[PDB]
Structure formats: structure tokens, C-alpha cells
Design a protein around this ligand. Structure first.
Ligand SMILES: CCCCCCCCCCCCO[C@@H]1O[C@H](CO)[C@@H](O[C@H]2O[C@H](CO)[C@@H](O)[C@H](O)[C@H]2O)[C@H](O)[C@H]1O
Ligand SMILES: CCCCCCCCCCCCO[C@@H]1O[C@H](CO)[C@@H](O[C@H]2O[C@H](CO)[C@@H](O)[C@H](O)[C@H]2O)[C@H](O)[C@H]1O
Ligand SMILES: CCCCCCCCCCCCO[C@@H]1O[C@H](CO)[C@@H](O[C@H]2O[C@H](CO)[C@@H](O)[C@H](O)[C@H]2O)[C@H](O)[C@H]1O
Ligand SMILES: CCCCCCCCCCCCO[C@@H]1O[C@H](CO)[C@@H](O[C@H]2O[C@H](CO)[C@@H](O)[C@H](O)[C@H]2O)[C@H](O)[C@H]1O
Lengths: 267, 267, 267, 267
């Protein structure tokens, strides 16, 4: 039986490193999104019976740890176009895989919503009485993509992602810094998981916990074709572009904050 | 006194590796079930006073860590017939111990319910007024075995275990993969504990947190003879077979998802 | 200034290993009790405003980790007369330090209540209106020592500690087993902290989280002389002796469960 | 592109070790305060909808872990003038950097409030209806700095910080003790994070979780000029000086408790 298993391994082997890493990014984001949006569905469809907002933070924080362990060796498990932007901005990785990773991250995050929707098919439909509504007392689209609260405005909503992404970049850069090793090597999976955990508890009130263009726009495109319709994009004065443009500008904002004070002054 | 202790060690020693590993599986599942169903009793019999649903997730997630530390070296602490099925499916372990482990896992999970029932004897009887009812406002049988919610249907209830088991297999396979080591070796106990933790927070709303045939059918057989009666099996249109057949088909569904994208493309 | 610090180090140095270890046990239990009973006061005096029962489990579980790190190298940080009983029962430690550790554990747990009482002096007095009552709607003595619930009886209350202590011993023995090392050495502090964490979430409903004669009877003697009076001992049909005699008989009950199935069958 | 990045690294390099460490302290406290006061804003401005008090403890506890990982190698990430006082008190560090670190810790904690205020600009203003009030049913200044509760008095409020700081010092000293290594080296970031976690759950009811002069007085100076006014300092009979003087006297109170019992009696 072992020979049969070994024979199948050599048949589907691909010698292309770029293609091998793109596949690991599709699975890395699929695990993160399915365990991320799946937890939000648990505390939204149950009206808080099966957990509060701390369940979302623990699940989102520890899903990054699992996604990194799954695909960390193959590609590094960036799981974030903003994170991939920072690595390419520091000459740590070529620019030719910036769109390759993004296409393999947006797709895979789109699949992560499909698994959640098929997992909560009856709960989602019966939440609002066989109808799908983007947001409100019976809103359902907020499970997959993040939406602003009532108090949020456009100007401050932009700066929530900029601050959230900048804090993530500074903490992530210190962990993945070769010259900064305050912990034994190999604990990158656990250390990053805490970073995403405290982000949800700290800055996860205005709109949610996106801090990633793929995790936000990925499942959002799924909800548009899943029954919610065009109302997904036009909610809150075209909110869809805020969690994409802002984190990209927040990635380079965490490089300037970190490198100018710790990264450059290291031996 | 040391000589007396050493003398007793040589008297009960068995040289059979297969028997030695089966005993470690009985204790591994007993610890997992007792700490798993014991936590559910805490938040059900107390009506949420002594904790919410996050207590169940933390206890279930960290009971696997303790059960692995107890029996990891002796047998590996599969604690799941679906997990044991995947290992035998990848030629990592002989097929002759698939029924041996299952018999030593179902038994041991049955004992894990007996310890919980004797631990909460007065609370269980006085929960519904000296009567035992399978489910409802005063239901008690839901502590040991998992039962579907009102919104759950048969078709989607089948796919909850398939999705839950597939996600577990992909994350577990990456951890126990010899060629995939993104973390220093020996942290298998901690990494697996997080996998079961996020499963409860993500997909623990429709029916509960079973994702294991032994943890579901094990204590369920105990409740049938403990006073609940035949109503345990026939609740929800013969729900008992769903958390057994589906995870078995979900174990091979996580092998195809993981190996075809990460496992095969590794050196 | 360094010479002055070095001079003071040699003045108070004691060459007695037994005395040096007893001092580390007084601090190990003081840290555990102060952080244990301090957390219970937070969720009792605030009526759940500043946390639920999960706060108690996290604080009690992670206080053992801190207490072990403080005194693990000096003496091992047993922090439990039942745990010390098991070690002496397996010839791992001489019987002459069983009463020495117990006296240094009960004292030190008594001090751990004094720090908490002085920390919450106004909250405790004003909780019931300048009066001290053992238990009830305004009870205060339940913060330090554990008391049975209304549903609890004498027979089952005895077996809660026996089951709770036996589960602790099996998990602790596997961690401290020289021949059972499923995790890299040195992680004893973290692994034990999870064991006490899941005990509170699983079997912390009937009476509380004692599973230790020193943590239960230690601060209980403090409450008797702190204003509560003789009502502390006579509550619930002389409940004071149950969390002392039962865990002692539960320590040898975890040795027989563990050694007969895993410990003896190891190389 | 790599040459351009390397050229910029050599341009802004400073060869002064004292200045390099001060910059790492500004970022270490900025990360701690922003993730600390940011979490308090989440559970205060949302009226508990987005989390309870356990969210504050988890975020405050794990922010110290992230701040240590960011600046641990550069300077050690004291993040606390009381902690820096203890190190200088044990001849482990020169006295000339006691005011340098404090100035680089108070500043940086002041910035940590500015990021939070800009992150929650609409929520803070609309919390009380376009008005800023120090404390009360609609109070807002309690997010940044800690304020006493109604039951708290002046005498016991002083001893809360003394007990809270002394417990922190004893646990921190044992971790950073070269002669006390019960855990493999390099886990200082994780072990310290648990110490601050249990402090919030244990002694975070009377006033809050300050146990640090920079985290308390830092953002408090920000609130005075941000609209709250002079009422910040004069609330609760000049409460501002209590969380500064008391922790300083509690730092030397943890040295005498720890060194006299464990630290001195070590080889
Ligand atoms: C809700 C949203 C959640 C968002 C979560 C975001 C998680 C971000 C995790 C960042 C992980 C970065 O991981 C880091 O990647 C870089 C990529 O060059 C790796 O870098 C290494 O490998 C790559 C190839 O993979 C080499 O080209 C490079 O020279 C080498 O240094 C690091 O070894 C790894 O530690
Ligand atoms: C609520 C339900 C909770 C469900 C929790 C399920 C937990 C699942 C844990 C899976 C643990 C698998 O653990 C993994 O087992 C395989 C079994 O071959 C071991 O494999 C190793 O040992 C076995 C013998 O034990 C050898 O035959 C094999 O060649 C060798 O590689 C791995 O070293 C171990 O890491
Ligand atoms: C709410 C209640 C909470 C209860 C928490 C209880 C915590 C229990 C922790 C148990 C720790 C045991 O720790 C274990 O102690 C034994 C004691 O012989 C040590 O054993 C070692 O040191 C001792 C001296 O210290 C030697 O005599 C012995 O030969 C050697 O093996 C182990 O190296 C240590 O790992
Ligand atoms: C809400 C408030 C939160 C408060 C949180 C407080 C966190 C406190 C963390 C304390 C960290 C101390 O960290 C410890 O610092 C000392 C400082 O000499 C370092 O000491 C080492 O480096 C320094 C230079 O940096 C040398 O001069 C010294 O000889 C050497 O031993 C230790 O290697 C480090 O482990």
C-alpha cells in the first residue's frame, strides 16, 4: 500500500516553486477565512448565546497560527496583501510575486466564505426569515465582510485600518526580523497569532477585524453573488474600498515607524 | 521503599506493544471525554452562571493537549477514529490497529461519561426534578452526546461534521508531517490543542463539538443505559449515526485537500 | 554599589537545603493563593461586572505557572500536599519533608489570604454593609475557602475532590515522568498551568476549585480569626474536612490509575 | 532596489547605545499603551457589547509580550519605571539611565494615548453627546488613565498599587534571574505576558490595571490637554500621584520579599 501512495506522490509533483507557493497561499487564506468568518457566524446567528466578541478574537488570532503552521515552510504564509507589500518593499522578496500572491490570496478567501456559507446554510437563511439582508437587526452580510458601525464616519474609518495595519506591520516585522531574535527561532507561528489576537480586542469595534485586503474583499465578492446583491458594495457610502486602499498605505506606514527606530539601529 | 516500588513495576509489565498502546488510548480518551463533557455540564447545569460557551471551547481545546501529553509517547494519542483512519490511509500505520484503537477509544470514552455522571450526580438529577429528559428546556442528555439545534436539518447536519473533520485533518496532518516542520519538534501537543479550540468557536453552533466518532457515540451509549432510555438514539430523526459516518468520510476528505496542495509538493 | 549588594548576599545565606526549599514553598503557595483568591474576590465583590467565572479559571490556571517559575528550581513547587503525597508515595522524595512542606504550604496559604484581605479591605466590608457573613446573597467567606452549593450533598461532595485530585495527579505525573517526555524538557511550568485551568472549567461548579488541602484549609483558618467567626467551619455540615481528607485519598487514586496503565509500561 | 535599502540603513545609523535603547523604550511603551488603552475603549464605549473585562486582561497581558518582542533585544523592554527602579536597585543596570528610560517611557505612553484617541475619535465624542466628562455614567477619561471606584478610599488605594507592583516584581525578578532558570531561556516574552495577565484578573477591580507609573501618568497628561481639562488631576482627592509614588515604593518592596527568600539562597 505504501508503494501506491508513493507512486501518486510522484505523479502530481510540480517542480515550479512559484506555483507551489501560490497553492500554499490559497490554503493558508482558506483556513484563516473559514475559521475567521465561521466564528463571526457563531456569535451573530446565535445572538450571543454561543459566545461573545471574545470568541471572535480568540478564533481569528489562533486561525493565523494554524494557517502559518500549514503553509509557513512552503511560502511563509503572508495571508495579507499588506504584509506581502511590506516584504517586497524591504527587498526581502521579489515584486513579481506581489500580484501572484494577491490573486492566490483573494481567491482562497473567496472559497473560505463558500465553506462557511455551506456550513451555516439553514442558520443564515432562517436568521432573517428566508431573506438575505446586508445589515441591520437581522443583517447577515456582516459575517463575511466588515461593515462600519453607526458612529463611524468616512474620515476616521479610513484611519482605523491605517492604525490597525501599521500596528500589525511593526509587530510582524520585529518577529520576522533576522537581526531581532528575542525568542528562540521557530516560534513565528505562535508570536504572530498573539498579534492578530490583540488587534481584535483593541481596534475591533469601529468596523470589525479586517486589517487585510484579502480577508475583507475576498468574501465580500462572494456575498454579492450569493443572494445579498449589489447592496453589499454601496453600504455606508461605498465602504468596500476603504479596507483595501487604507491597509496598503498602512503597510508602508509601519515600515517607516519600525525601521526608523529599531530596524535600522541593529547589528 | 524504592525496592518495593521497583518490584511492582516488573510484576505487571507487559511486553506486547499493541496492548500497551491500547491502554494508553483508553486513558487518552478518558481524559479528553471527562474534561470535555465535564465542562459542558458546568455551563448547562448552572444555566450559564459558571461560564458561557467559551468555557467549553477552552476546556475541549486544552483537554486534547493534556491527553496527548499523557499518552503521546506510548501510542501517539489519536483520540479520534477519523484521525486513526487518516494515518492508516497514508500507510503511516498498519490497518490491523484500526479496530483495536477504535475499541480502545469508544471504550474509555464510555468511561469518561461515567466519571462525569458520578461527579455531577445531584446536579443532573435535580436539574429537571428527579427526572431525566434527553433534550429541551430541562434537557440533560446533551451534556454527553451532541444533538442538533432546531434550525438544523439532516442534509446540512451531515456536512457540518464533514467540514469540521476535514478542517481538523488538514491542520493535524500539517503538524504531524515529517517534511513540514515550521515549528520546533515536540510542540505537537500544544499545536493540536489550538486546532480543537478554534473548531469549537467556529463550527460549534449547529450541533456542538463532536468531530470524533468516539467522543460522540462513546458517552451516547452510556446515556442510553443511565436512565435516559431509547429516546437518545431516536432524537432528531435518528441523529446518532450522523456524527459517526460523516467524520469517517471527512477524514479522507482532508487528506485529498491537504496532500494535493501541500503534502505532495514537499521535499 | 555592586559590592554592597554582594556583601548582603553572603550575610543571609543559609547552607541548609531543607530550609531553603521550605522558604520557596511559602512563596510558591503565597503567589498561588493571592492570585487565586484575589481573582475570586474580583468576580464576587463586583457581582460579575469585572468578569465571570472564566476569569477565575484563567487566573487560577496561570497562577500555578507563575508560582512554579518562581520556586520550581529551588524545590519543585509542589504547592499541594496531595501532590507532595504522591511524590513521597513513589519513592521520588523522602517522607521526612512531607510534614515540612505541608507546614510551609498551609502557612503561606494563610498569608495569601492576608494580602487579599488587605487588598480588598473596603470592598469586603462594604459588600454586606459593615458586616461579615460566611455565605448567602451577600456572603464573603466564599472568596478564600470553597463552600458547597445548594444542590451538593455530603456523599457526592466527597467524590468531587477525589475525582478532581485524581485527574490532577494523572496529568501531573505524566508531565513530571522522566520516562515520559512528549514535549521538550523545561515546559513543566506551562503544561501544569493548563491542567489546573481545565480543572476549574470542568469540575469547578459543585463547590469551587480547591483540589489542594493547603489552598482550602489555609485561607479558611484566616477567615475564622478575621471576623467571620466559627460559622466558617460548621457551614454545610462540617464541610471543612472534606477538601482535606478526600484529596489525600485522591492522590493515591491517581497513582494507581496512571501507573497501572502508562507509568509501569514504559522503558 | 536592495542597494537603495542598504544605503538608507547606513545614513540614519547612530552609534550611541544609550540613544538606541531610549528609542526602543518609546516604541515598547507606545505598543503597550495603544493596545492597553485601546482595549479599554472597546469595552467602555461599546457598553460591554464588544467584550467584557476579560478582554482588557487578555489585551493588556499580551501587549507586554508583543512590546517585549519588539524591543527586548535592544534595551530589555522594561516598560515600567518601577521595573527599571528594581534593576538599578540590584546593580544590574547603571543609575544614569533611570531618568533617561523614564523620560522615554512617559513620552511614548503619551503618544500611545494620541493614537487611541485618533482611532476612536467619533466614538469618544459621541459617547457623551459631543462633550467630554472625566468619570460617571458617561465618563470617558477612564479609558486612558485609571480612576478609583466608589468604594475605594485613599489609604487602601495606596496599598493596591503597592501589592500589585510587589507581586509583579517578584514574578519578574524570578524570570529575569540568571541563576533561576526553570524554563528554557528566550521565553521571557511569554512568561512576563502571563504575569501582567493575572494581575488584571486578580487586582484590577479597585481602580484598574496601572501597576506602572508611565502607563498611568503618561496618557493622563494627554487627557488634560485633549479637552477633559483640569478635572482629570483633581478627581478622587488628587488621585494622580497615587499610581506613581506607590509603585515606586512597591518595586523595592518586591526585591526584599523575593531576594530574602529565593534570590539570595541560590547558587
Ligand atoms: C485578519 C487578518 C489576519 C492577518 C494575518 C497576517 C499574518 C502575517 C504573517 C507574516 C509571515 C512572514 O513570514 C516570513 O516570510 C518571509 C518571506 O520572505 C520569510 O523569508 C524567508 O523565506 C523566503 C521564501 O519563503 C525567502 O525569499 C527569504 O529570503 C527568507 O528570509 C520568513 O522566513 C518568514 O518568517
Ligand atoms: C472533540 C474531539 C477531539 C479530537 C482530537 C484529535 C487529536 C488528534 C491528534 C493526532 C496525533 C498524531 O500523532 C502522530 O501519530 C503518529 C502515528 O503514526 C506518530 O507516528 C510515529 O509513531 C508511530 C508509532 O506511534 C510510528 O508507527 C510511525 O512510523 C511514526 O512516524 C507521530 O509521531 C505522532 O505525532
Ligand atoms: C488550586 C490548586 C492548584 C494545585 C497545583 C499543583 C501543582 C503541582 C506541580 C508539581 C511539580 C512537581 O515537580 C517535580 O518535582 C519533583 C520533586 O521530586 C522534581 O524531582 C527532582 O527534583 C527533586 C528535588 O527538587 C529530586 O529529589 C528528585 O530526585 C528529582 O527528580 C521534578 O524535577 C519536578 O518536575
Ligand atoms: C500595565 C503595565 C505593564 C507592565 C509590564 C512590565 C514588563 C517588565 C519586563 C522586564 C524585562 C527585563 O528584562 C531584562 O532586562 C535586563 C536589564 O538589565 C536584561 O539584562 C541584560 O541586558 C542588559 C542590557 O540590556 C545588561 O546591562 C545586563 O547586564 C544584562 O543582564 C535582561 O536580559 C532582560 O531579560
Amino acid at each position: 500500500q505504501k508503494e501506491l501512495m508513493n507512486r501518486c506522490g510522484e505523479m502530481l509533483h510540480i517542480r515550479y516553486r512559484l506555483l507551489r507557493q501560490a497553492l500554499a497561499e490559497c490554503l493558508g487564506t482558506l483556513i484563516l477565512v473559514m475559521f475567521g468568518c465561521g466564528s463571526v457566524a457563531q456569535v451573530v446567528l446565535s445572538r450571543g448565546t454561543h459566545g461573545g466578541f471574545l470568541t471572535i478574537n480568540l478564533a481569528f488570532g489562533f486561525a493565523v497560527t494554524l494557517a502559518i503552521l500549514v503553509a509557513g515552510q512552503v511560502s511563509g504564509a503572508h495571508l495579507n496583501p499588506a504584509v506581502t507589500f511590506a516584504m517586497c518593499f524591504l527587498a526581502r522578496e521579489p515584486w513579481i510575486k506581489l500580484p501572484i500572491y494577491t490573486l492566490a490570496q483573494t481567491l482562497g478567501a473567496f472559497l473560505g466564505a463558500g465553506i462557511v456559507f455551506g456550513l451555516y446554510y439553514d442558520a443564515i437563511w432562517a436568521f432573517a426569515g428566508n431573506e438575505l439582508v446586508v445589515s441591520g437587526p437581522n443583517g447577515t452580510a456582516g459575517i463575511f465582510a466588515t461593515y462600519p458601525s453607526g458612529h463611524l464616519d468616512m474620515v476616521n474609518g479610513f484611519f482605523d485600518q491605517f492604525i490597525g495595519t501599521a500596528a500589525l506591520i511593526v509587530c510582524v516585522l520585529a518577529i520576522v526580523d533576522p537581526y531581532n531574535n528575542p525568542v528562540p527561532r521557530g516560534l513565528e507561528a505562535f508570536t504572530v497569532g498573539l498579534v492578530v489576537l490583540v488587534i481584535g480586542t483593541s481596534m475591533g469595534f469601529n468596523s470589525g477585524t479586517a486589517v487585510n485586503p484579502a480577508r475583507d474583499f475576498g468574501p465580500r465578492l462572494f456575498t454579492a453573488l450569493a443572494g445579498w446583491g449589489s447592496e453589499v458594495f454601496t453600504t455606508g457610502q461605498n465602504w468596500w474600498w476603504v479596507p483595501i486602499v487604507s491597509p496598503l498605505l498602512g503597510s508602508i506606514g509601519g515600515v517607516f515607524v519600525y525601521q526608523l527606530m529599531i530596524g535600522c539601529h541593529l547589528e
